[PDB]
Amino acid sequence: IRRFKASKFVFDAFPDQVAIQLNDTHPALAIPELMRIFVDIEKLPWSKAWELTQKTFAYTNHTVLPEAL
Amino acid sequence: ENVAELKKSFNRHLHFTLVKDRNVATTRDYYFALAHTVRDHLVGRWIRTQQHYYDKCPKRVYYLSLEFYMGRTLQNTMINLGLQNACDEAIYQLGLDIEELEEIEEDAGLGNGGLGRLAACFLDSMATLGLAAYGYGIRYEYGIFNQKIRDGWQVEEADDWLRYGNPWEKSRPEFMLPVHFYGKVEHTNTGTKWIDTQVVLALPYDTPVPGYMNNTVNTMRLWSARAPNDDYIQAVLDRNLAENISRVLYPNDNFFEGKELRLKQEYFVVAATLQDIIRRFKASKFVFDAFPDQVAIQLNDTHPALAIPELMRIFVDIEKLPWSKAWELTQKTFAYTNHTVLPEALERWPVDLVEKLLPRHLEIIYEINQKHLDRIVALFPKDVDRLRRMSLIEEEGSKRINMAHLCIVGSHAVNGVAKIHSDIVKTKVFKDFSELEPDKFQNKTNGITPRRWLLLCNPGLAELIAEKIGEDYVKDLSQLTKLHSFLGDDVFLRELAKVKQENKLKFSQFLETEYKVKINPSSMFDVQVKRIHEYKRQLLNCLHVITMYNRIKKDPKKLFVPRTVIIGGKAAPGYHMAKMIIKLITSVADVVNNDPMVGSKLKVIFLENYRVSLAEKVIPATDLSEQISTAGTEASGTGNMKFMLNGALTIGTMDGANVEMAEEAGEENLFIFGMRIDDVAALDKKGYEAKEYYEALPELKLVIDQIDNGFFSPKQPDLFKDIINMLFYHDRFKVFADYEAYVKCQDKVSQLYMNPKAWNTMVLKNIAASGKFSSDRTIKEYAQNIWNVEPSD
Amino acid sequence: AYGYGIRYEYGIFNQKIRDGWQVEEADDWLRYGNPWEKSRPEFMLPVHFYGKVEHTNTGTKWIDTQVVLALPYDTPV
Amino acid sequence: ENVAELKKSFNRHLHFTLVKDRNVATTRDYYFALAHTVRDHLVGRWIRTQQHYYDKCPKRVYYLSLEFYMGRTLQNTMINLGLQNACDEAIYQLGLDIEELEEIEEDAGLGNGGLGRLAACFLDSMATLGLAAYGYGIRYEYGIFNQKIRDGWQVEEADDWLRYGNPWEKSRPEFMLPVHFYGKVEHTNTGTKWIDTQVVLALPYDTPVPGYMNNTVNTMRLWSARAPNDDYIQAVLDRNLAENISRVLYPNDNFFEGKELRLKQEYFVVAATLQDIIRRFKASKFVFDAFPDQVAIQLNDTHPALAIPELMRIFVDIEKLPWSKAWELTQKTFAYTNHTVLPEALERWPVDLVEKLLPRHLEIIYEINQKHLDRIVALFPKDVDRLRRMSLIEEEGSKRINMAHLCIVGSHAVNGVAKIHSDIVKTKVFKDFSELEPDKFQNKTNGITPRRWLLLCNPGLAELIAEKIGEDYVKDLSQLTKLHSFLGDDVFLRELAKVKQENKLKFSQFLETEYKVKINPSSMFDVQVKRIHEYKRQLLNCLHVITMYNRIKKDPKKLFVPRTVIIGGKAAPGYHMAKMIIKLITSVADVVNNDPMVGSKLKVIFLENYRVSLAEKVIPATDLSEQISTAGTEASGTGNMKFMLNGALTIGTMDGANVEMAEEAGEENLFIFGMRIDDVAALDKKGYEAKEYYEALPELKLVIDQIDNGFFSPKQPDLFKDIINMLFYHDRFKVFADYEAYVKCQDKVSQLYMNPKAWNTMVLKNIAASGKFSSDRTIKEYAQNIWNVEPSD
Numbered sequence A: 001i002r003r004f005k006a007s008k009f010v011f012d013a014f015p016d017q018v019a020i021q022l023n024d025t026h027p028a029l030a031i032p033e034l035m036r037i038f039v040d041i042e043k044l045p046w047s048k049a050w051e052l053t054q055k056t057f058a059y060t061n062h063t064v065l066p067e068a069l
Numbered sequence B, D: 001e002n003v004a005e006l007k008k009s010f011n012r013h014l015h016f017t018l019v020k021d022r023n024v025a026t027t028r029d030y031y032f033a034l035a036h037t038v039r040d041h042l043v044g045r046w047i048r049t050q051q052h053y054y055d056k057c058p059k060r061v062y063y064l065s066l067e068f069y070m071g072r073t074l075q076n077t078m079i080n081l082g083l084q085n086a087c088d089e090a091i092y093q094l095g096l097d098i099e100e101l102e103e104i105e106e107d108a109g110l111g112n113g114g115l116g117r118l119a120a121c122f123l124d125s126m127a128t129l130g131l132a133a134y135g136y137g138i139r140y141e142y143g144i145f146n147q148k149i150r151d152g153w154q155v156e157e158a159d160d161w162l163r164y165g166n167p168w169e170k171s172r173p174e175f176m177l178p179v180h181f182y183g184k185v186e187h188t189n190t191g192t193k194w195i196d197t198q199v200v201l202a203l204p205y206d207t208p209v210p211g212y213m214n215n216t217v218n219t220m221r222l223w224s225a226r227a228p229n230d231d232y233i234q235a236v237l238d239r240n241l242a243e244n245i246s247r248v249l250y251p252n253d254n255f256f257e258g259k260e261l262r263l264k265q266e267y268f269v270v271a272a273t274l275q276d277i278i279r280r281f282k283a284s285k286f287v288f289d290a291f292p293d294q295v296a297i298q299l300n301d302t303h304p305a306l307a308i309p310e311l312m313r314i315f316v317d318i319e320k321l322p323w324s325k326a327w328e329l330t331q332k333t334f335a336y337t338n339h340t341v342l343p344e345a346l347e348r349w350p351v352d353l354v355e356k357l358l359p360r361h362l363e364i365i366y367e368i369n370q371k372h373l374d375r376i377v378a379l380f381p382k383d384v385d386r387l388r389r390m391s392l393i394e395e396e397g398s399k400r401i402n403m404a405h406l407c408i409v410g411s412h413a414v415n416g417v418a419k420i421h422s423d424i425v426k427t428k429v430f431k432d433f434s435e436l437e438p439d440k441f442q443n444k445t446n447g448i449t450p451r452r453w454l455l456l457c458n459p460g461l462a463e464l465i466a467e468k469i470g471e472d473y474v475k476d477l478s479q480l481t482k483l484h485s486f487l488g489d490d491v492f493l494r495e496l497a498k499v500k501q502e503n504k505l506k507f508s509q510f511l512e513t514e515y516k517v518k519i520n521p522s523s524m525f526d527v528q529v530k531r532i533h534e535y536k537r538q539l540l541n542c543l544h545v546i547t548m549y550n551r552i553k554k555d556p557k558k559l560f561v562p563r564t565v566i567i568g569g570k571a572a573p574g575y576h577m578a579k580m581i582i583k584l585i586t587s588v589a590d591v592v593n594n595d596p597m598v599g600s601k602l603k604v605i606f607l608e609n610y611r612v613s614l615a616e617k618v619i620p621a622t623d624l625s626e627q628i629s630t631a632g633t634e635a636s637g638t639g640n641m642k643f644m645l646n647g648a649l650t651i652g653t654m655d656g657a658n659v660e661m662a663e664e665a666g667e668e669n670l671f672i673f674g675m676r677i678d679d680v681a682a683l684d685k686k687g688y689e690a691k692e693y694y695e696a697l698p699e700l701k702l703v704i705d706q707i708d709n710g711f712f713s714p715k716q717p718d719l720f721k722d723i724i725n726m727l728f729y730h731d732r733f734k735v736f737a738d739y740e741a742y743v744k745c746q747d748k749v750s751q752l753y754m755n756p757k758a759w760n761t762m763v764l765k766n767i768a769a770s771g772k773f774s775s776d777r778t779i780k781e782y783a784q785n786i787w788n789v790e791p792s793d
Numbered sequence C: 001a002y003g004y005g006i007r008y009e010y011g012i013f014n015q016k017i018r019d020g021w022q023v024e025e026a027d028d029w030l031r032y033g034n035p036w037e038k039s040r041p042e043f044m045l046p047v048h049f050y051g052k053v054e055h056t057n058t059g060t061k062w063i064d065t066q067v068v069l070a071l072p073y074d075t076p077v
């Protein structure tokens, strides 16, 4: 986010400048953390924030083993 | 209050309230639809807040002022209600631009400058602190005139601010009140009667004052004059005469014009206010002995001085209280704020005018004075000249009333608005009164609201700060000192400088589209915006500008830090020197901006129609804040505080609050220069001979000769004759006396500017020390040491 | 593209076999220094843990948290 | 090493070493680029110097200490390599400010005070004298805590000095060594074995110690603890436990805390050092009979006392030498320096702790003691109490080891650090040992390096002196006596006073930007900086300050020489009285600095985070040096020497080296006052009753009552109760006993200060007599009378 703000780029264009790949579910907390930042800090409305969040993140599933979940 | 619902409310208002669809709606229609959409969010809490004051009856504060320099309301409201981001989204989804809709709104320019803006910041701080406070003023049909520049001169255009409607005001018919003028007095055996008077009705209009994120919404009650209903045509037309009382704001800043109409406005606002206050007290679920414990009235300068004898009139003539008791409750009710020490600004109404217009008030004033002098004659039997000095009456020829003296004896507290100022008020100007009553005189350093002057005008900065230290600073600005932790944080300094840069680009766009000039976005934005005054000296600034131009003309290739020098402000209509100085600046700018040799090195702009909404644009884009009044002339200043809070460095004198800014941030972190108060005094005694400096300083001589010989006005070589004459023979603000130190200081500023890291480090030290200057702290001190009221957090 | 992860002081353990069984040893890979990483001190950030939620009229805030700084190290790819 | 080439190297490092360009580089990046640019200049001579020691095998000196209070390295290195002026030019041409880059560097605060700073000065003098000397210590991850003042109290913050990297240190992997703890002992037929121990690795880090202008660069080797590599997660985390051994410096100055972790650090540094020393000896192109002729190990106090039984362990258990021979070579190898005589500072480790942690060392210590007492029983058959007094073991209840006794019998020389101190050590504290061995006890008066404490910290002075008498004084400070020739040289006295003035302005700028206070640049800078101790008495000083404030409050117009009183220093974290005294001083300063009546007459500052780099700033700006310990308590002192060398006059007691300063400069040229050693003794016998002075001295009573009644702590009237209680009933440093003489002395100081010519003449007499106090002279005496080593000039 700091790098986005410093760029020559609101946040509307955030997903057009940023793509974050979630390698397995280990960094899953990144979804609610981005929301927390957008909402609690940046004061964006939930709807707007959630839309941006989905466009930013992509999730890669690496396993179906129950003990790995 | 979510995005989907705001769009729906917006569409609903556009339809039912503006009678439009998306095809025929105008931009004004959209602004109004949004204004109403936002306004509906205030209602619930406005009713609850005023209802809660009645039930719990906390002591109320009444801020009585002839001025409330409010600026625009839409954005401020969205921010304090936490609605801005959602509204921004809604409007965007509707395919509109909220910032464009915002520009449709007229400023409620019901003030001249600092005095009026202080009142406005105070209402915001009081609602944010949760105090049961009310602002009482006049609903002028025309505010401070709109300023146009024609052929380099200021031209005034009427500010018809209500032409299209004010969604932010609410008519309160049920509270209309009659105000009396002229007539005669009768001292009957049933009390004294003020009869055969002319009557003018006062219709009150309430505007909500939302606190910052706290459910509190207070009230600003502004009175409008209306002719009462008991050649026919002429008789109906003449109803205009009574209605002229609230027609227009007197456009004088720090200057007393003793016009009868002004006196009428003063009693109008005072009579309506006090009667409304007493009415509410009497309806409160509270004899009058408890009045002072339920009511505090702050006099914003001496303009509402008549409130003192009006309260006594009400208590004695109406409520039938004995003089002694009335007097006691009166002093305990009023507190007075002195905002100036310039001779020409002192309110001294001729006795004959007051006798004709307000006969009962003159009588009461004479009584007040009599009981006043009798006590002095007692304590100081011999000192006859002391009685002359402390009298509410000046008998020297044309007998007049000294309103400040009346405010002093009728109030339990008197305060100045900056330490140095309050000191001079207590120990010099009013020595005889403070020696007699030590504890009466206080200081209450001015402040500015960090909502309007930070959150609103510079969101990029408010956001950057919040990311580093949280949002607590909004409601407790002293929290900005934590910023000190980042003085060696390189990345933060870069982020800080980026915010200033973006503000500069945004405003450079405003300049280029509003004026011819091409702006060097990287040049230093050197700014001086405030009312035009000889004491504020934009003239000194103009000398520095001409000086820089000549340096360029001589050494075109010398390494020069490029500047965009901006100077703006309104001159009172009848203030000749002020109007001449404006013409000088525009003339200078025309030469500078069009000389091929300087080009992008130096651009000069006379910012037109300086007002609250324009201050919000230029202040955040400023690098260097000009606060150069002659030591002893600016009681406090507040524009100086706005620039400090927004990342500009200050070049100024040790005057007003500039002194406390230096104390908080460290003197080395401000570009202080010139004569201090003692130097001015000493130079006075010796006698000030302007010629010396002129002869003694070569760069100054060239400047002076150029202005004098027509260099800056070829077609009228002697155009600036009056300026030259005043400068050499009648300058009581010692312009030439600070020229040298001022120019030397300016060079040091340019030096530092070449060092971005050093420059931004000092900026950070200023921002981090600006906390004292929040009006929330000023109001806390007023609540605690004068009004004796408590918040609700 | 950028890779973002954690700079563990100890990576996956070094495995040894004792009496036929696996035995683990700490992979102290930074002991002698890593010329391939570049500390980026100016980008250190605070990270919050624990604490509580406060639902205010100013907007829900996470307060009384424990803080841990995050110092980034860039390795070229 | 010329300007053009330094800029190129700087740019090269910024690029390849810091991966930056001028646009994105931070100030820290610039500091690092310069540090590396300078560092490269050391390499060639560091390799040659260490190579030359191996080829020529001169006897080596090993200075073993748990402390090395080094301060910053950049400037010191530039100066000793003659690179400063060129680097200053280079950086300036690059558009940077070298002094700003210098401030980025963290102090290597690996010490508490004098003991640690003495070691640091010694390394500089030894490299400058060209001796084959090595400093051996611990590479603490955290040095002496950073001190913050919050609400007037000291708060400690971790000194994470390595966070951003230390370019001045070099990892030496190939010399890692294992250190053993715990375990058990086995006396087998192949020698005794220390088995089943816990192992912690010691990784050595070398820092270069450049001599002043001589091509010599010695080494400071500091050991860092690392867990060896043969719930998994917890097992990996637990590696922290071994690594905690070198985690942090124990923050006690002159106080013994018998914590097991401290004992671990002590054996850690001793085991790694001696094994490294023996390894080098065995690889030298030298049987062990020649060991003592090739190695000298100086024990900096008793902290590394375990080195004695460790060397014996190595010789006996490892090298298989017979006890008798091992013992002989051991005594000839070690020399011990006693740095204190305060009871609470004595190291007395409980036998049980040593048995558990170092079983083999306990055994060896018992043997040492046995052979020790058997010899005494022989020479003195009857004296049973003599054996009790000279035993290495204290059996009185909780049995513990007297480390000083172990250092005395295991060393061939024992020295104190000031004549008066060494006398007391020899004739009182260790009488039984010196009577038994006269020639073993010596004196070696402390000294300070004139590079860091003159050339570096006060270039203006070093330059002024050099212009008068040349530069030879740098390497032979006794050359300063030539300055005597200028005692009647008026122009020189003016030049001397100008240097002090400039230092004062420079530091006044530091004060104003760091603290609120406005500094009177012309006032007398009265300074007391050193660790906070009851025996050092900044409390007495505080009484004098309050005294001066009261005098001002009474006679506001009396001619008073204005002063800026500065008191700073860290208090050990668990030292309650020390922390209370700090709070007292800050409380006093807040009243004084904000009382309108005193104003610019008196300002008080509690200098925060006093450390080496800050001593370099304040010392050169000092007029009056406070060295007021109670006679008999300060073994020597060295801060006293720094002030003398830098142009301050001294007000102190006849204690430690203050006595020799008086001898060198003439007693009349120092403001000596109070009880001398004999007076303290006499007052002891009689019994000290604090009340007498309190009742007997009116100015003291007012001071005391004020502190006691809350005058200096309104909101907590009883806050200073403990201070008051200690003062009347438990003050073993007789504060009230010297109050009178102290205040009388202070007045004489102010008297002289009014006489600029008389004042500067005495200053010159102090500077001219400061030559004895160079650590180069101290090291010459150590080399000649103890280590038996020779230089290389």
Ligand SMILES: O=C(N[C@@H](Cc1ccccc1)C(=O)N1CC(C(=O)O)C1)c1cc2cc(Cl)ccc2[nH]1
Residues within 6 Å of the ligand: B016, B017, B018, B019, B032, B163, B164, B165, B166, B167, B168
């Ligand atoms: O005045 C109406 N809406 C209002 C809406 C409004 C109210 C307050 C401020 C701005 C706009 C209106 O357009 N104005 C009040 C202003 C004035 O007093 O000049 C301008 C309105 C809506 C409507 C709808 C029907 Cl069907 C008939 C008459 C109507 N008047």
Ligand SMILES: O=C(N[C@@H](Cc1ccccc1)C(=O)N1CC(C(=O)O)C1)c1cc2cc(Cl)ccc2[nH]1
Residues within 6 Å of the ligand: C031, C032, C033, C034, C035, C036, D039, D040, D042, D043, D046, D167, D168, D169, D170, D171, D206, D207, D208
């Ligand atoms: O640490 C130096 N060079 C570095 C070189 C290096 C850097 C990165 C990885 C491996 C090696 C060094 O030896 N190490 C960093 C590693 C660690 O963090 O432990 C080991 C160095 C060079 C030098 C030269 C002088 Cl004159 C004085 C001190 C010095 N230190």
Ligand SMILES: O=C(N[C@@H](Cc1ccccc1)C(=O)N1CC(C(=O)O)C1)c1cc2cc(Cl)ccc2[nH]1
Residues within 6 Å of the ligand: C035, C036, C037, C038, C039, C074, C075, C076, D016, D017, D018, D019, D032, D163, D164, D165, D166, D167, D168
């Ligand atoms: O660590 C590098 N330079 C070093 C340079 C340095 C060395 C010693 C002290 C201070 C600075 C560095 O920046 N630091 C070592 C410190 C630490 O251990 O935290 C910080 C470095 C340069 C470089 C260049 C490339 Cl292309 C890739 C990786 C790199 N690392």
Ligand SMILES: *Cc1c(COP(=O)(O)O)cnc(C)c1O
Residues within 6 Å of the ligand: B112, B113, B114, B117, B529, B530, B531, B610, B611, B612, B615, B636, B637, B638, B639, B640, B642
């Ligand atoms: C704040 C403000 C002022 C007062 O500014 P000074 O520089 O203190 O005189 C005047 N006019 C406007 C529009 C302002 O916002």
Ligand SMILES: *Cc1c(COP(=O)(O)O)cnc(C)c1O
Residues within 6 Å of the ligand: D112, D113, D114, D117, D529, D530, D531, D610, D611, D612, D615, D636, D637, D638, D639, D640, D642
């Ligand atoms: C020299 C020095 C000391 C020792 O000073 P004394 O006044 O002799 O106790 C302590 N701390 C620092 C930082 C020093 O430089």
Ligand SMILES: CC(=O)N[C@@H]1O[C@H](CO)[C@@H](O)[C@H](O)[C@H]1O
Residues within 6 Å of the ligand: B114, B115, B118, B253, B254, B255, B301, B339, B340, B345, B417, B446, B634, B635, B636, B637, B638, B656
């Ligand atoms: C009469 C009048 O308008 N006085 C003005 O009041 C404001 C608010 O106190 C001051 O900041 C300013 O210096 C002063 O000129």
Ligand SMILES: CC(=O)N[C@@H]1O[C@H](CO)[C@@H](O)[C@H](O)[C@H]1O
Residues within 6 Å of the ligand: D114, D115, D118, D253, D254, D255, D301, D339, D340, D345, D417, D446, D634, D635, D636, D637, D638, D656
């Ligand atoms: C235990 C200890 O730190 N002793 C200190 O050692 C230094 C260096 O010898 C002396 O100058 C000082 O007076 C003394 O207090």
Ligand SMILES: O=c1[nH]c(=O)c2[nH]c(=O)[nH]c2[nH]1
Residues within 6 Å of the ligand: B251, B252, B253, B254, B255, B344, B572, B573, B574, B575, B576
């Ligand atoms: O009409 C005036 N208005 C002013 O504000 C002013 N100030 C001043 O000096 N003269 C005048 N005149």
Ligand SMILES: O=c1[nH]c(=O)c2[nH]c(=O)[nH]c2[nH]1
Residues within 6 Å of the ligand: D251, D252, D253, D254, D255, D344, D572, D573, D574, D575, D576
């Ligand atoms: O924890 C302490 N450290 C000290 O340095 C000291 N000195 C002292 O007298 N008591 C204490 N306590």
